[PDB]
Task: structure prediction
Amino acid sequence: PVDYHLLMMFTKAEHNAPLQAKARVALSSLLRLAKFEAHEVLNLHFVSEEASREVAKALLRELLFKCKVIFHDVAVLTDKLFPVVEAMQKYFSAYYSDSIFFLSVAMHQIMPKEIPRIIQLDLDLKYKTNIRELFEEFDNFLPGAVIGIAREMQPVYRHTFWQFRHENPKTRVGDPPPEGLPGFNSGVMLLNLEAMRQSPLYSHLLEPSWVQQLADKYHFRGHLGDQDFFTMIGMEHPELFHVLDCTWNRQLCTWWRDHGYSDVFQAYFRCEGHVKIYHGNCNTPI
Ligand SMILES: [Mn+2]
Result:
């Protein structure tokens, strides 16, 4: 038997209508289009407090190869995360309870060695293809690449990295694809836990003095959590990241097009190809 691990954040879902409506679109399309071989099993990890754990379990009964549904206690993971992720919530969430928004950063240390690879996924997603096909992207990783991630399709990191770009007008940091580095979107993340444990460079980038060192270089104080950490790391060391094709995460949010970046927005938003996963980020319908 071969295991395939998926992780989803499912917090504060109790009496939350828009979140439950999102999860219905996400989990339905995921399971309706999923097709695995008889010998292999799909594992669905959810991190939820006692309240939302009920909401999830009740929703999966309507929708359910073997597929094990695992539930992770929010507090247990938060308590485990905090001593490892404290030095970077003052930089990427510029207090204790908000350590769970950095789960992806230290997924390898939180998850058991029994699990080699996991895909963290948002709930504002729609799945247009089979999810087993995404796992194939792990094979396209270079040795020394730890994370699989799609690029950010909004000029978010123009404004975020403003001061660095003001000092380095030639830089690619914040520039649109393909020549520039637009940053990453954390909606769909292929986390190679095995590679994350084995990489000395990644092990050191998680250390306090290293986070500080690099954040000060870019004058970085963000608000996007784990996404900001990966994005900043991807500026110094882009070779740690296997950049997914945009079709794996076509983000639909057009906010910045109407709030400051009308001119350059398209260079970031552009994505030609048959969509495999839609990400209705910022409450955008699909
Ligand atoms: Mn999202």
Q: What stands out?
A: Residues 127 and 159 are 30 Å apart (CA to CA). Residues 17-32 form the longest helix (16 residues). Residues 1-286 form one domain. Residues 122, 124, 187, 279, 281 surround manganese (II) ion (CB under 6 Å).
